[model samples]
Structures are given as C-alpha cells and as structure tokens.
Target: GSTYVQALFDFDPQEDGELGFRRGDFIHVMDNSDPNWWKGACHGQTGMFPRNYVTPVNR
Candidate 1:
C-alpha cells in the first residue's frame, strides 16, 4: 500500500523514530519540505529523513 525501497545500513527505527520502520520496511516516500529533509511515512505516521540518504527502488 506504499512505496518500496531498499534498505540502507544506517536505518533508524528507534523509539520516536517517527518513520516507524526498520531496514527494508518498505517505507513510503510522500514529499519533501526542506532541502535536506524528506517525508517518510509508515504506520500512518511520518518523519523527515536526510535527503538522498536512500536510493531509488532500484537506483
């Protein structure tokens, strides 16, 4: 029901991680607000992650 992308080694699915995902969790990329921040959504919640920190589904 969301975008699927590969997992990076630096995945942060910790407490208050907000994205609510871990490595290979198929997080959905919705939008971007800042030049270095991107909106990642999971479990009906969202968080900003470093831009380009993740690659395309294939890259």
Candidate 2:
C-alpha cells in the first residue's frame, strides 16, 4: 500500500537504507496533482508508470 511504503522502510532500516531509501522518498499524491510528487502534491494515479515517466535519453 502507498501508506505502507514509508512504514516498511522505517521498520526495516537496514534493507531500506541499503537500497538508498530515505524519509520523504516516497511521495504522497492526490488528484489534480502535477503527476510528480517532487513538485509537491497530495495524490494521483498510483503505479510505477507515473513514478517512472521520465523521458528517454540517448546514450
């Protein structure tokens, strides 16, 4: 669950920390949001799609 993401990290610092996870890394989103939590929003579509919607780059 979205809410559980942080709690999971909190409970398992070793694993989460090893994976480079930190507080506020997980976004709390809502509708009408900018589709990006880094911009600051409440809620939005829940999935890895919106999360990893970065533009492709040439190597």
Q: Which one is best on lDDT?
A: 1
Lowest lDDT 10-residue stretch of candidate 2: 7-16
Q: What's the residue-level lDDT of 19 in candidate 1?
A: 57
Measured against the true structure, the TM-scores of the candidates, in listed sequence, are 0.53, 0.18
After superposition, which runs of candidate 2 have C-alpha atoms over 4 Å from their true positions? 1-24, 32-50, 53-59
Q: Residue-wise lDDT of candidate 2 within 1-59, one digit each (tens)?
A: 23222312221223311223334344332232344322212233232213332222222
- Any runs in candidate 1 off by more than 4 Å, and if so which? 1-4, 13-17
The alpha-carbon deviation from the true structure for residue 22 of candidate 1, after best TM-score superposition, in angstroms, is 0.7
- How do the residues 1-59 of candidate 1 rate in per-residue lDDT, one tens digit apiece? 44445445355654465454555555567876666656777557778665555555744
Give the top-scoring candidate (TM-score): 1
